[PDB]
Amino acid sequence: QLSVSEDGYIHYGDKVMLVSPDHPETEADLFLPGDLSLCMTPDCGLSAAQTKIPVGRNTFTILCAAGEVIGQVLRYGQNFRLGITGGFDDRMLYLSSDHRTLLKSSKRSWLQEVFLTHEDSYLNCWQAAFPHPQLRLEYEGSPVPANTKILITHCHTNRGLVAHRHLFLRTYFGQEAEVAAHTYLDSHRVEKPKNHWMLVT
């Protein structure tokens, strides 16, 4: 069971699962139909299956990276950690990545790659931000609500978690989607619906 939000905003210590909202876009031509939720994937890795209920394989406990308290209101553009509990008695796991070299390339598209690992560093902190480019500095550092379209950005690559539904990863489960970290910008240089995310409660 996830944690309810009294006020609209998402505190730390809340059990929250991560899902990309549904896209009205048509340029991709290959298209998982709607509301694709991120998931832990073994053969670990990381990939978003189809829309799912909170199943514990999805559920992220919103931790603290700058030494914050268990219940604390979270603002845009501030570091936090998002921790997935292991199936057995494993305490914490970390949404991780690395600056790209030749040999650490993502599966099925040679982009940045996002995976899960035990160890702790600054490559585990993420900060979420406003989608509109003209309003980021107006609303930066403001309490972020429950179920809203916000972008997920790193704090050492400044890239962003991409809903890359062009390609399909057939798994043991058969539900599919590939997730990397890459920032996309339009001909007007605005952030695409390819990169949006929503942290449901």
Partner: protein, 440 residues
Amino acid sequence: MRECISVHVGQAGVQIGNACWELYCLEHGIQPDGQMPSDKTIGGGDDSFNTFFSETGAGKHVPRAVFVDLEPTVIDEVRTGTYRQLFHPEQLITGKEDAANNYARGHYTIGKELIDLVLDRIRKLADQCTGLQGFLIFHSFGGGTGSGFTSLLMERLSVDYGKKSKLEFSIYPAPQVSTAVVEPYNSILTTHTTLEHSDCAFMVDNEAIYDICRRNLDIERPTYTNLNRLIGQIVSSITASLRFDGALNVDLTEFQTNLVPYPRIHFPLATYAPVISAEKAYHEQLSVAEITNACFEPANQMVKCDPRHGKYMACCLLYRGDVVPKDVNAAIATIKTKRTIQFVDWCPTGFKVGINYQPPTVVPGGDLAKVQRAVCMLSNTTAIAEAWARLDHKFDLMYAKRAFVHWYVGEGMEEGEFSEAREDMAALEKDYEEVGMDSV
């Protein structure tokens, strides 16, 4: 910054100035009011459109274009069309009497009194620019304004600005069918005069796109709009690299450097690769090698002139979509000297490549679907020397019995201009014969 003006001349200029500029409105976010819709998100500081669309404060994007005509029944379809609020009324120049399939009408008598106002307006659309890449001329060799006034636009433009870029995309006559009869007198006496007053060029014959549309699509009984749309699809890919980023880039100063070996030999062709219908787009999957070989095949050519008879003098490529420079450079290498493809020996490297990420955009009511790769290739050849030789054939034939000529002398015109415009193509036929000679 990085502005580039369109100057379209004729009612062919206005039938092209609607279909081009309707693609340009939906290639960017523009509505027919002019303003992009509120709830469309743009960061504001980065403007892709600014080559073509000017800006006031309120957000209205008036194009930097002027249209030229001498009879109002073609611009009055623009002035109360769908786009009647987008185009600022000063830019759409109308005469009162048309030059009426002639040269000296629009070159000395009637077009003389309409170079006054257009020169006033191009100094009001080229003061706004910081860096003007070049103008563009979209004119038809057939009618009076497209042949007479167009060359007199050219000569005055040389005095006023010097060495700016002035490209043309010219509607050359088709070899078999035509609008009219008196068209060669207007098609050689402008070509003889627009030689020292032209930077780069292209050609199209109107019957050649008629061939492509039926043999590649099922659009039976086409229309000029179904041809004016593909002219939009080929002008957009000329300027595709100016506004949107890429792995490589092609600017407008850049065709003439790599395709004009000599400053009178500036006559490429034009070709657009993936001509394929919407119910044929889904079935056949396509690759970068697949779109290149079509531009090499003679069926896709926008002229009725096969370069199998001639030598590929130089080339230009404009790729688009999801192309890799790795597989662009593989089919380029797969094409040869020993094939039906054959190059001159004095152009050994022989290419220019430009790669744009932004995929081509589909216009409502057209024919082609959401294609994902494309080519705009502009290859010079020695084969154009047969296109002049057929128009030499049918001009001195009409000049043998000295026909239609009273319609030319008494319109403020001299006499010997026929005797030199046949002389001038005779040396330029020799000039195009020696440009392709093997090394001695």
